[PDB]
Design a protein around this ligand. Structure first.
Ligand SMILES: [Mn+2]
Ligand SMILES: [Mn+2]
Length: 545
């Protein structure tokens, strides 16, 4: 009846998005069919999918919110409402909203949760610069970071010189002296009140990406320093404190029970959606979604001691249903005009739905495994990175280079071929499983399993560490712990424990994909999950339509 036409509410409005991952154009982004959790974490925000998520939030099936929120009815709703995101539509929506708030005499802040500058055609072609420029066009007040660092320390410093907003992070410090490199927070006047925005960058940057990108930096989660920063903002006059975070929602939730003084957390990193805020301790938590699919409008009623009340609305960024942001459209045309040929020409047509997100398995990741095995038939197992970023290809839709970059646009995209003993394969899976499924609530945090094309296994998320992965089979034959298997991997560090295939030169995964796609012309990868999940129903979306 009116997704965007909202009446005024409160003293301040936060317009928040996160994990855009350089997605410049309207595209499709389906939520995961599964977000598997150990028994203790089931049924909570960050672990809800399908029908369950709709019910939890009281979202009616078939609505624009349902289209964004769940994989249920995906293909059908994508045809109905159209693509989401695009920097043009996102900008138009942010401006529409900011203009409404200011006309009400309210104070509006545009907040970016990070994982913004990277992983897209536009980003790769400009080493992130064009994304920074767009941020400057819309007018981002603050941002935090994670994948930004894959551009390397030097390049990030350069880009921050261009970024007109104020970058925040309490946790990024020099690894020798420990001095913070950036402001921990910023206090903004909101009428008679003061509202502090504290920033937190992803604390595991060092172990998640090439160490050389962050040489000289520490990103470690420091609760003592976090508390001190919150205590300081207040002593300096802050009535309410908001944490603009890239810790990940489950980690944010743990902190809400350990840190005092945080009134609201805008949770990035986990690519979650929270149509209603998640109350944890004395803190409200609102997720940043991803890929430009939504703008979270958080209206705040402040009081001398914090946040009195709040209104949260997930605003769908529907390109077909929003006005154009002319300057943005113009900037994009100017930036990618010289490369539209490369970026948008079809490489192949996908007959069925290609999706990326899921705890265990995806049709997109299988496609990649099939491409690798096709070009390198000696490869027995292909380990694909379970990143949260990517895009969704509809049936009959043509795959382009822009999609390849959205899916495999790492700054370190090299595909490695190397041998692993059978015992290593099993241990790699068991190791990931122990991270992603730890029961202990004190230790959060969730976060998907590498997809291994060429093998099948049984997973029990509730079993003890060392017993979660069993009945591993490679090509129909039981895994032989002492056998050397030829593996392929990209977007990670698995190659570090393997023996490199002689004669093989690592090259960008996307070059392998383009070669394969151009040759085959059409692909049809139906969902055939390779994992038997103990104690859970494993779900699949409808891949035709
Ligand atoms: Mn992300
Ligand atoms: Mn992230």
């Amino acid at each position: 009846r009116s997704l965007y036409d909202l009446p005024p509410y409160g003293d301040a409005t936060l317009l928040y998005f996160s994990d855009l991952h350089g997605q410049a154009f309207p595209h499709y982004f389906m939520e995961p069919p599964n977000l598997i959790a150990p028994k203790p974490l089931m049924g909570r925000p960050g672990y809800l999918t399908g029908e369950a998520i709709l019910r939890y939030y009281g979202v009616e099936r078939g609505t624009p919110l349902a289209y964004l929120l769940s994989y249920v009815d995906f293909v059908e709703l994508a045809r109905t409402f159209g693509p989401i995101g695009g920097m043009g539509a996102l900008t138009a929506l942010i401006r529409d909203q900011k203009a409404r708030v200011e006309a009400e005499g309210g104070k509006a802040l545009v907040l970016d949760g990070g994982d913004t500058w990277t992983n897209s055609g536009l980003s790769l072609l400009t080493r992130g610069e064009a994304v920074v420029r767009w941020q400057n066009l819309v007018g981002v007040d603050h941002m935090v970071s994670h994948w930004e660092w894959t551009l390397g320390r030097e390049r990030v410093e350069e880009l921050l010189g261009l970024f007109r907003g104020e970058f925040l992070s309490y946790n990024i410090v020099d690894d020798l002296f420990g001095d913070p490199l950036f402001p921990a927070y910023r206090i903004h006047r909101v009428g008679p009140y003061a509202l502090a925005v504290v920033g937190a960058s992803y604390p595991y940057v060092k172990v998640s990406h090439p160490e050389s990108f962050t040489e000289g930096l520490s990103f470690a989660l420091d609760e003592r320093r976090l508390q001190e920063a919150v205590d300081k903002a207040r002593a300096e006059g802050a009535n309410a404190v908001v944490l603009l975070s890239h810790n990940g929602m489950q980690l944010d939730a743990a902190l809400a029970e350990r840190i005092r003084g945080i009134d609201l957390i805008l949770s990035g990193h986990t690519h979650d959606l929270t149509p209603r805020p998640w109350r944890v301790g004395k803190t409200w938590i609102v997720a940043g979604s991803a890929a430009g699919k939504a703008l979270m409008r958080v209206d705040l009623k402040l009081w001398k001691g914090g946040i009195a009340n709040l209104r949260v609305r997930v605003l769908p960024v529907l390109a077909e249903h929003l006005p154009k942001a002319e300057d943005v459209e113009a900037f994009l045309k100017a930036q990618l005009a010289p490369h539209q040929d490369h970026l948008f020409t079809p490489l192949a047509v996908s007959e069925t739905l290609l999706y990326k997100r899921d705890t265990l398995y995806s049709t997109w990741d299988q496609l990649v495994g099939e491409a690798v095995k096709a070009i390198y038939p000696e490869v027995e197992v292909v380990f694909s990175p379970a990143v949260r970023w990517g895009t969704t290809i509809l049936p009959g839709q043509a795959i382009t280079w822009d999609h390849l970059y959205a899916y495999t646009g790492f700054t370190y995209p090299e595909l490695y071929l190397f041998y692993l003993r059978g015992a290593q394969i099993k241990a790699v899976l068991e190791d990931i499983a122990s991270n992603v499924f730890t029961s202990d609530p004190f230790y959060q945090q969730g976060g998907d399993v590498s997809r291994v094309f060429g093998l099948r296994y049984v997973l029990d998320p509730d079993a003890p560490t060392g017993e979660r992965v069993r009945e591993v089979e490679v090509g129909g034959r039981p895994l032989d712990p002492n056998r050397r298997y030829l593996a392929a991997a990209y977007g990670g560090r698995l190659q570090r424990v393997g023996e490199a295939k002689p004669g093989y030169e690592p090259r960008p995964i996307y070059e392998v994909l383009a070669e394969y796609l151009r040759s085959v012309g059409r692909v049809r990868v139906r969902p055939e999950p390779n994992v038997k999940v103990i104690g859970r129903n494993y779900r699949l979306p409808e891949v035709t339509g």
